[PDB]
Design a protein around this ligand. Structure first.
Ligand SMILES: N#C[C@@H](O)c1ccccc1
Ligand SMILES: N#C[C@@H](O)c1ccccc1
Lengths: 256, 256
């Protein structure tokens, strides 16, 4: 079967991270939309204009709003993209056939929205050469960050080719986790986000979202299905593109 | 010998086009700077804020200005990048060891700055699915454009892989040739631009900068050296990356 996959990049990244996976999925006959979230990729906004993870998710929400009645999509979010998925699911649950988490945070409905992010910071406290700054938006002090090149090389793109790592150095932009804002955000709902089918994909060779963290997330909020990809790194859509496409094809044949 | 190469992308593109060449040059021991020109790549400005090819060249001029006395670089410009080279050479000729044109326009000093662009439009009049728009800046009506996906696929990235073509579809932005502005711009000078060493690199398999055009440019303004790369396409830095690196190494060993 064919599906319409909506690929969602992580913070400081853009649609470009899916440049290998998108054409492969299309070669299987699927429709693919790879969005640039607010102040990401070639989006015209700067991060200082964004005051929350919800505002950051605008392009995704706007895209879902534009889907004609009856049309459903399969969301695929990498790393922090899981938060964009939860936000989107609480507004357009009827338009989501399923959500696929790709070495991604997996928010729940029993704890605050920042819950899994707070845990991640516990498991991976040292972001190496990553730099930080602060800006104010809507009366709140937000912590912005720019991923360090060494962190990118060693922990995020560990096994990626030099040409892929180069794209990261050239294209990654300042962003934010909006952690303190998430902490005060209303909880994700059981009727919306809680109701969607969730497929969790990961590799135990991820050098930033370590096994302890990912296995902790799986136990905390049981996915409907779990796929473990052998080898690769945090950016499975670059290092295990074929494997990810095969998994997504099965998801398309399972949920509609 | 080692050199400091400054890679200059063409209109509607960004530093990302050099994502394969940059690490290869560094593997040879060179220093490489791949800039995003105004309103290009991840530069924060939008094209409507830019009123001339000179303003568009700001990042390059600012970079050259920051070079300490005595430090020289080898400029490498692709496609329309040759115009940025000419503009830069008339301001920082002493900081340029040589300029390498990569399937690039080759401005001269005997004719108006728009001369070779006007000729290009004669040789390649149909830009297929490319779209156009107009905006006003500093009292002048500027024609903006967004490269069509079919033009990108068939004429610019003819032999590039699907993952490279995907990057182009995701990252190319609105831009402009500022043709009418170039037509009224003071001529490039003989003392500045005219004095720098010029190396012309091209392939007769280029599907947009056709042989008739490139051979016409070579006869119009004789380069100090001409390198013809066999095969490949308009984006030699993607399809013949190794060959381009070998040529640049020879240039580094020849001009300083
Ligand atoms: N890749 C990616 C980003 O989501 C990221 C960057 C740094 C730490 C955790 C996550
Ligand atoms: N590649 C590239 C651009 O410079 C370009 C795009 C369309 C026509 C001519 C040149």
């Amino acid at each position: 079967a064919f599906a319409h996959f909506v690929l969602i990049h992580t913070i400081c990244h853009g649609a470009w991270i899916w440049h290998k996976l998108k054409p492969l999925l299309e070669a299987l006959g699927h429709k693919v939309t790879a969005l640039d979230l607010a102040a990401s990729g070639v989006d015209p906004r700067q991060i200082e204009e964004i005051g929350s993870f919800d505002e950051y998710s605008e392009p995704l929400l706007t895209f879902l709003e534009a889907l004609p009645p009856g049309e459903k999509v399969i969301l695929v979010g990498e790393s922090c993209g899981g938060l964009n998925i939860a936000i989107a699911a609480d507004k357009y649950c009827e338009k989501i056939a399923a959500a696929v988490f790709h070495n991604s945070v997996l928010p729940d409905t029993e704890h605050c929205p920042s819950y899994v992010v707070d845990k991640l910071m516990e498991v991976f406290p040292d972001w190496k050469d990553t730099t930080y700054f602060t800006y104010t938006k809507d009366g709140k002090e937000i912590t912005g960050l720019k991923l360090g090149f060494t962190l990118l090389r060693e922990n995020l793109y560990t096994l990626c080719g030099p040409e892929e790592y180069e794209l990261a150095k050239m294209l990654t932009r300042k962003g934010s986790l909006f952690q303190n804002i998430l902490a005060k955000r209303p909880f994700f709902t059981k009727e919306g986000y809680g109701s969607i089918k969730k497929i969790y994909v990961w590799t135990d060779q991820d050098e930033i979202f370590l096994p302890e963290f990912q296995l902790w997330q799986i136990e905390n909020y049981k996915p409907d299905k779990v796929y473990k990809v052998e080898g690769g790194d945090h950016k499975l859509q670059l290092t295990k593109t074929k494997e990810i496409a095969e998994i997504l094809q099965e998801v398309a044949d399972t949920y509609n």
